[PDB]
């Protein structure tokens, strides 16, 4: 009633279609090319999209170990994000930032022990508190020459910090460690943004 | 030494390339079209393949609930696989087959309770034992008119039964229920093959 196509095609519209729509936002060229490529493929062989999606899901450990590597890597070259501005509080910002970025980058090796990891949560929370503590001090004293989109980034950092805490508290419900590594990595990118906005 | 391309592209060759190679076996047309589509896409935006793969992994619950549905469905229309051959042992085969296919199809609702599920493992093992018990009896008494690729299917059923047991014992190590639903579904297809080989 109220109306075709077989049930095995479901994941094309349930899984693949929402991927392409969020992909048309960043690169229409590829998103369009892939869209019709899958559509033609499913008309050829019904259920093929599922077979594809299942094979991707099977490489979970590969993707986990890849994101792990990606998070560890995302602490290298901190000398790229150092400020020229004088003097004391900006050095302190640079430290609190580097410190936090490192603590985060080393999560994939701390998440094994529950004893080590519960300490790291306390350790990250301390680095974030001391990070924002330093930011607001520059926001109160030093004259914000040429720029003040820094405030937007400070708010953006907060959004990614609470999101990190949310996925962290979700980890003690799911067991899905991958979401923690992605969220942690995301937070490092946000830290980098603030730092670069002090430069650019 | 011994040699390019960035690290974010890794999953294209680690995850996507092995998908296409196992896909060229079933449908070269689509596999080829998708291959170059992704390749062009990664040359455009480095890391896009990862973003795609991550979005697919996020729809895990969708894919789990889809495979669940697919397994329950895979017991419908058993009248399609009923034998014309006379008389008593073939009816018994049909029963032992239907019984097993149903027990399997109802796993996604039994896997919640550990008490119900450990019983189902015992219950499936009983249906398989009694299934093979019946097969060998037709293989010993009744004259195998026109066909005897049935023996190949009997061996193929066994291969998918031990594989089911293997992924089942892996479930008590992984917690990944999806592999159980896929393997169970696979075993139903094998059951159907034997039955259809008695017909065709």
Q: Do A56 and B19 touch (CB under 8 A)?
A: yes
Answer yes or no: do B10 and A66 touch at CB < 8 A. yes
Q: Are the beta carbons of B15 and A56 closer than 8 angstroms?
A: yes
Looking at CATH, the fold of the domain delimited by B59-200 is given as: 1.20.120
Write the burial class of residue A140 (CB in 10 Å: 0-12 exposed, 13-18 middle, 19+ buried): exposed
**Residue A3 burial (C-beta neighbours within 10 Å; 0-12, 13-18, 19+):** exposed
- Residue of B7, B27, B56 with shortest CB distance to A48: B27
User: Is the Cβ–Cβ distance between A133 and A166 less than 8 Å?
Assistant: no
| Cross-chain residue pair A63–B44, CB shorter than 8 Å | no
Q: CA A189 to CA A101: how far, in whole Å?
A: 9
In chain B, which segments carry CATH 1.10.12.70? 1-58
Task: Specify whether the CB–CB gap between B195 and B81 falls below 8 A.
Answer: yes
Residue to test with chain B: of A28, A57, A66, A76, most B Cβ within 10 A: A57
Q: Is A66 within 8 Å of B10 (Cβ atoms)?
A: yes
Report which secondary-structure segment, H or E, holds A26.
none
Separation CA B120–CA B111 (nearest Å): 9
Letter string b/e over residues B59-74, b meaning 16 or more CB atoms within 10 A of that residue's CB? bbebbbebbbebbbeb
Q: Using the beta-carbon criterion (under 8 Å), do B62 and A175 form an inter-chain contact?
A: no
Measure in Å the smallest separation between the Cα of B40 and chain A Cα atoms: 8
Nearest chain B alpha carbon to A14? B62
How many CB atoms are located within 10 Å of the residue B195 CB?
21
Name which CATH class applies to B1-58: mainly alpha
* C-beta of residue B104 within 8 angstroms of C-beta of residue B124: yes
CATH 1.20.120.330 domain residues, chain A = 59-200
Number of neighbours of residue A41 by Cβ within 10 angstroms: 20
A87: cis peptide before it, omega within 30°?
Answer: yes
Determination technique for this entry: X-ray
**Token digits of residue B176:** 């990944």
């Amino acid at each position: 009633x109220x109306x075709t196509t077989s049930m095995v095609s479901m994941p094309l519209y349930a899984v693949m279609y929402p991927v392409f729509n969020e992909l048309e936002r960043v690169n229409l060229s590829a998103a369009q090319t892939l869209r019709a490529a899958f559509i033609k493929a499913e008309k050829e062989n019904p259920g093929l999209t599922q077979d594809i999606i299942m094979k991707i899901l099977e490489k979970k450990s590969v993707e986990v170990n890849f994101t792990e590597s990606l998070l560890r890597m995302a602490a290298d070259d901190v000398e790229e994000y150092m400020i020229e501005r004088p003097e004391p509080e900006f050095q302190d910002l640079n430290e609190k930032a580097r410190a936090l970025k490192q603590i985060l980058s080393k999560i994939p090796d701390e998440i094994n022990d529950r004893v080590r990891f519960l300490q790291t949560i306390k350790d990250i929370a301390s680095a974030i508190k001391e990070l924002l503590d330093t930011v607001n001090n520059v926001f109160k004293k030093y004259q914000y020459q040429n720029r003040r989109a820094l405030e937007h980034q400070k708010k953006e950092f907060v959004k990614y910090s609470k999101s990190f805490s949310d996925t962290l508290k979700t980890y003690f419900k799911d067991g899905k460690a991958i979401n923690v590594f992605v969220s942690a990595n995301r937070l490092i990118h946000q830290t980098n943004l603030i730092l670069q906005t002090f430069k650019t």
